[PDB]
Design an enzyme around this catalytic site. Sequence first.
Site, PDB file in Angstrom:
ATOM      1  N   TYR A  71       0.849  -1.191   0.000  1.00 46.11           N
ATOM      2  CA  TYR A  71       0.000   0.000   0.000  1.00 46.11           C
ATOM      3  C   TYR A  71       0.883   1.239   0.000  1.00 46.11           C
ATOM      4  CZ  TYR A  71      -3.765  -3.157   0.769  1.00 46.11           C
ATOM      5  OH  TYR A  71      -4.601  -4.213   0.486  1.00 46.11           O
ATOM      6  N   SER A  72       0.608   2.174  -0.905  1.00 48.37           N
ATOM      7  CA  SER A  72       1.300   3.465  -0.921  1.00 48.37           C
ATOM      8  C   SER A  72       1.115   4.158   0.413  1.00 48.37           C
ATOM      9  CB  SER A  72       0.737   4.378  -2.013  1.00 48.37           C
ATOM     10  OG  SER A  72       1.061   3.921  -3.307  1.00 48.37           O
ATOM     11  N   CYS A 253       0.093   7.526 -10.859  1.00 46.38           N
ATOM     12  CA  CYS A 253      -0.268   6.488  -9.912  1.00 46.38           C
ATOM     13  C   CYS A 253      -1.758   6.200  -9.943  1.00 46.38           C
ATOM     14  CB  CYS A 253       0.159   6.883  -8.504  1.00 46.38           C
ATOM     15  SG  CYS A 253       0.074   5.531  -7.338  1.00 46.38           S
ATOM     16  N   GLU A 293       3.730   4.231 -10.933  1.00 45.85           N
ATOM     17  CA  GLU A 293       3.325   3.151 -10.042  1.00 45.85           C
ATOM     18  C   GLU A 293       1.842   2.875 -10.253  1.00 45.85           C
ATOM     19  OE1 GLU A 293       4.594   2.894  -5.682  1.00 45.85           O
ATOM     20  OE2 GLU A 293       2.459   3.393  -5.541  1.00 45.85           O
ATOM     21  N   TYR A 295      -1.278  -0.359 -10.674  1.00 47.00           N
ATOM     22  CA  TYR A 295      -1.616  -1.663 -10.119  1.00 47.00           C
ATOM     23  C   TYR A 295      -3.078  -2.001 -10.384  1.00 47.00           C
ATOM     24  CZ  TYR A 295      -2.838   1.740  -6.444  1.00 47.00           C
ATOM     25  OH  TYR A 295      -3.299   2.821  -5.727  1.00 47.00           O
TER      26      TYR A 295
HETATM   27  C1  LIG Z   1       2.926  -0.517  -5.110  1.00 41.50           C
HETATM   28  C2  LIG Z   1       1.450  -0.750  -4.835  1.00 41.50           C
HETATM   29  C3  LIG Z   1       0.775   0.169  -4.172  1.00 41.50           C
HETATM   30  C4  LIG Z   1      -0.589   0.015  -3.888  1.00 41.50           C
HETATM   31  N1  LIG Z   1      -1.224   0.974  -3.232  1.00 41.50           N
HETATM   32  C5  LIG Z   1      -2.493   0.855  -2.904  1.00 41.50           C
HETATM   33  C6  LIG Z   1      -3.207   1.960  -2.167  1.00 41.50           C
HETATM   34  O1  LIG Z   1      -2.686   3.006  -1.788  1.00 41.50           O
HETATM   35  N2  LIG Z   1      -4.548   1.735  -1.886  1.00 41.50           N
HETATM   36  C7  LIG Z   1      -5.234   0.595  -2.267  1.00 41.50           C
HETATM   37  O2  LIG Z   1      -6.434   0.469  -2.010  1.00 41.50           O
HETATM   38  N3  LIG Z   1      -4.540  -0.358  -2.971  1.00 41.50           N
HETATM   39  C8  LIG Z   1      -3.236  -0.292  -3.282  1.00 41.50           C
HETATM   40  N4  LIG Z   1      -2.641  -1.268  -4.018  1.00 41.50           N
HETATM   41  C9  LIG Z   1      -3.302  -2.607  -4.332  1.00 41.50           C
HETATM   42  C10 LIG Z   1      -3.243  -3.448  -3.066  1.00 41.50           C
HETATM   43  O3  LIG Z   1      -1.939  -3.933  -2.851  1.00 41.50           O
HETATM   44  C11 LIG Z   1      -4.009  -4.785  -3.100  1.00 41.50           C
HETATM   45  O4  LIG Z   1      -3.776  -5.420  -4.399  1.00 41.50           O
HETATM   46  C12 LIG Z   1      -5.534  -4.523  -3.168  1.00 41.50           C
HETATM   47  O5  LIG Z   1      -5.821  -3.772  -1.988  1.00 41.50           O
HETATM   48  C13 LIG Z   1      -6.364  -5.721  -3.205  1.00 41.50           C
HETATM   49  O6  LIG Z   1      -5.861  -6.664  -2.220  1.00 41.50           O
HETATM   50  P1  LIG Z   1      -6.885  -7.629  -1.470  1.00 41.50           P
HETATM   51  O7  LIG Z   1      -6.116  -8.362  -0.511  1.00 41.50           O
HETATM   52  O8  LIG Z   1      -7.975  -6.758  -1.043  1.00 41.50           O
HETATM   53  O9  LIG Z   1      -7.376  -8.586  -2.669  1.00 41.50           O
HETATM   54  P2  LIG Z   1      -7.080 -10.277  -3.224  1.00 41.50           P
HETATM   55  O10 LIG Z   1      -7.888 -10.801  -2.116  1.00 41.50           O
HETATM   56  O11 LIG Z   1      -5.700 -10.729  -3.487  1.00 41.50           O
HETATM   57  O12 LIG Z   1      -7.865 -10.090  -4.488  1.00 41.50           O
HETATM   58  C14 LIG Z   1      -7.125  -9.709  -5.589  1.00 41.50           C
HETATM   59  C15 LIG Z   1      -7.131 -10.801  -6.585  1.00 41.50           C
HETATM   60  O13 LIG Z   1      -8.483 -11.100  -7.055  1.00 41.50           O
HETATM   61  C16 LIG Z   1      -8.525 -10.819  -8.463  1.00 41.50           C
HETATM   62  N5  LIG Z   1      -9.308  -9.582  -8.888  1.00 41.50           N
HETATM   63  C17 LIG Z   1      -9.170  -8.266  -8.460  1.00 41.50           C
HETATM   64  N6  LIG Z   1      -9.976  -7.404  -9.060  1.00 41.50           N
HETATM   65  C18 LIG Z   1     -10.726  -8.173  -9.978  1.00 41.50           C
HETATM   66  C19 LIG Z   1     -11.792  -7.842 -10.951  1.00 41.50           C
HETATM   67  N7  LIG Z   1     -12.326  -6.616 -11.216  1.00 41.50           N
HETATM   68  N8  LIG Z   1     -12.292  -8.852 -11.683  1.00 41.50           N
HETATM   69  C20 LIG Z   1     -11.795 -10.094 -11.478  1.00 41.50           C
HETATM   70  N9  LIG Z   1     -10.832 -10.535 -10.627  1.00 41.50           N
HETATM   71  C21 LIG Z   1     -10.320  -9.502  -9.886  1.00 41.50           C
HETATM   72  C22 LIG Z   1      -7.073 -11.061  -8.929  1.00 41.50           C
HETATM   73  O14 LIG Z   1      -6.761 -12.476  -9.021  1.00 41.50           O
HETATM   74  C23 LIG Z   1      -6.302 -10.332  -7.809  1.00 41.50           C
HETATM   75  O15 LIG Z   1      -5.000 -10.907  -7.711  1.00 41.50           O
HETATM   76  C24 LIG Z   1      -1.283  -1.151  -4.304  1.00 41.50           C
HETATM   77  C25 LIG Z   1      -0.536  -2.125  -5.003  1.00 41.50           C
HETATM   78  C26 LIG Z   1       0.781  -1.956  -5.254  1.00 41.50           C
HETATM   79  C27 LIG Z   1       1.475  -3.078  -6.015  1.00 41.50           C
END
Ligand SMILES: Cc1cc2nc3c(=O)[nH]c(=O)nc-3n(C[C@H](O)[C@H](O)[C@H](O)COP(=O)(O)OP(=O)(O)OC[C@H]3O[C@@H](n4cnc5c(N)ncnc54)[C@H](O)[C@@H]3O)c2cc1C
Length: 295
Positions: A71-72, A253, A293, A295
Amino acid sequence: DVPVNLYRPNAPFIGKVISNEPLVKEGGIGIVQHIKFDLTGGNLKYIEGQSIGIIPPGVDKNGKPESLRLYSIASTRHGDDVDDKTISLCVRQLEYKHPESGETVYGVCSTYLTHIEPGSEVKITGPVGKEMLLPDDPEANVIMLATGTGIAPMRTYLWRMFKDAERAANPEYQFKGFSWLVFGVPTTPNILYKEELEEIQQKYPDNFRLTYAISREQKNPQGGRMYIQDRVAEHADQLWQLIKNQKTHTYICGLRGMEEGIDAALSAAAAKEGVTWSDYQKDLKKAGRWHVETY
Ligand SMILES: Cc1cc2nc3c(=O)[nH]c(=O)nc-3n(C[C@H](O)[C@H](O)[C@H](O)COP(=O)(O)OP(=O)(O)OC[C@H]3O[C@@H](n4cnc5c(N)ncnc54)[C@H](O)[C@@H]3O)c2cc1C
């Protein structure tokens, strides 16, 4: 000077949630929370532009520990209260579709974080990232192209640049250049930190420009919904002329996919003066002036 990996996944810092506030106002789409953690008890230092990891509780469907999500960082190095004791995040709850097994799927770490209560302990790793860092040059121009939670690194820059409390705390950085945020969100109640961004533009009308692209409320010239790439194409000549300044840094971003429409607009502008943008852009990345950046 850049702290990296002060804490790693095998022995994380255990912080505590201080607050969890909603950013999306009534009438808006989705849930995006501003979460502040207490950093006292450890030595997590960080600067603007970086990220931390959060390890959510539980196991995946195979029985394995859930791994970290990045998370940023949404606060400056000093934290929101400017006391050097906290760190903030800007987290959207992920939820999606039917043709992906069952009904509505909720993201693990993002559901966990957006519903977490004050006093709860969180596993934190980092910080990580050297790609989104801000120059200590007070006369830099800073173009900021953000969608959704990509506002997060942008907020750390702007606060350092323009908050009264930050300016008193950073005697070496008194920003006097120009910065321009183009911020793409679906609705006006989805403008994260609206009141604070607009207060900044009122105090510094010559140092900060604020442009929105609001798709449920604005149409582009072609009759479609207004997205950030539509606003960038509208101001392509201006943005190109600022990018030519040796002092100008551009930050991008947000969610993956916004990069292609920004390039096609800046491509048509650069071409007018015989410049191939995709080649000019490679030199900008090499020079450390083009920051991405997504994602
Ligand atoms: C450098 C960086 C910075 C980030 N900063 C932020 C930030 O500031 N705020 C923020 O909210 N997030 C940010 N993110 C994204 C964050 O890391 C997580 O990926 C995001 O919050 C979702 O994680 P989760 O655990 O909620 O989801 P998971 O439970 O892992 O669900 C995600 C998975 O489900 C699937 N999926 C996701 N969306 C869809 C869709 N529309 N249709 C179908 N399948 C889908 C994919 O397989 C994905 O891998 C950032 C990511 C990176 C890499």
